[PDB]
Structure formats: C-alpha cells, structure tokens
C-alpha cells in the first residue's frame, strides 16, 4: 500500500540525508514557489501509525490545519516537508521517530519510537 510504496519508492528530503523523511509527490501543485520560513501555511492531512491505523484527520474536522512554517510548531518532518511543496500540491510522507515524536510519543495515539505515514495537501501559504 501507500506507506510500503513511499518507504521503498520516496526521495529522502533531509540535508543530513539520513533517510529520515521520506516523500513522493502524488498531485503536482502550482507554479514553481514553495513557502517561506515564516509564512503561514494552511493543509489538509491525513496520518497513519505503522500498524495500519489512523491517528489524525483534519478533513474529519472540516477545517484546515495552520501553522508558521519552520518554527518548530509541528514536528521536524513537516517543517522540513511542507518547505517543499507547491500550493495544490499533495504527498506523501514516511517520517522516522527521529523526525516526529521520537522515544517520548505523543497521547492518546503515538507509541514509543513510532514511524509516521501522512497524506498533506498544501492548501495555500502567505506571509504576515
Ligand atoms: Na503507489
Ligand atoms: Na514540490
């Protein structure tokens, strides 16, 4: 399914190139820009746990998930994701614990040393 094929088919997007945020791009996005650390950015995602379930949907709450790009608001693989992509644009990515919730996890959901799939739409972006 989707987290094998982007575990064994995705481009790694670290600068430490450590295979630790996975992508595939699945909707080409708009135009050639990407946001600025700093902008506002608005998405569409959808998250799975390694055992198959989903922990997350902001398409179930009927409103888009916004945060200032960069800031550390949101975990390491997302910050470093969302900085690649064009608005319209949806992908895929498999974000080792290292880039997520590490050996802490997160409540309710998130073990322990999780490995992370999402589906984020980029929405739109704009600076303040
Ligand atoms: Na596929
Ligand atoms: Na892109």
């Known amino acids: 399914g989707a987290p ?5 088919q995705g481009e790694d997007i670290t600068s430490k190139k450590d295979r630790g945020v ?14 600025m650390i700093g ?3 608005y998405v569409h995602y959808k998250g799975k746990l390694s055992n198959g379930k989903k922990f997350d949907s902001s398409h179930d ?12 608001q ?3 693989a997302w910050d470093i994701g969302v900085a690649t992509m064009k608005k319209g644009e949806i992908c895929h990515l498999l974000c080792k614990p290292e880039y997520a ?3 802490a996890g997160s409540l309710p959901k998130i073990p322990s040393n999780a490995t992370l799939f999402f589906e984020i ?4 972006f ?3």
């Open 4 to 8: 094998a094929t982007v575990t064994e």
């Open 101 to 103: 919730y590490g050996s």
């Open 22 to 35: 996975l992508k595939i791009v699945k909707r080409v996005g708009n135009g050639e820009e990407t946001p």
């Open 74 to 76: 949101v975990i390491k």
């Open 61 to 72: 709450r009927n409103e888009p998930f916004v945060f200032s790009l960069g800031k550390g």
């Open 126 to 128: 704009k600076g303040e």
């Open 121 to 124: 739409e980029l929405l739109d």
């Open 39 to 41: 902008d506002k950015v």
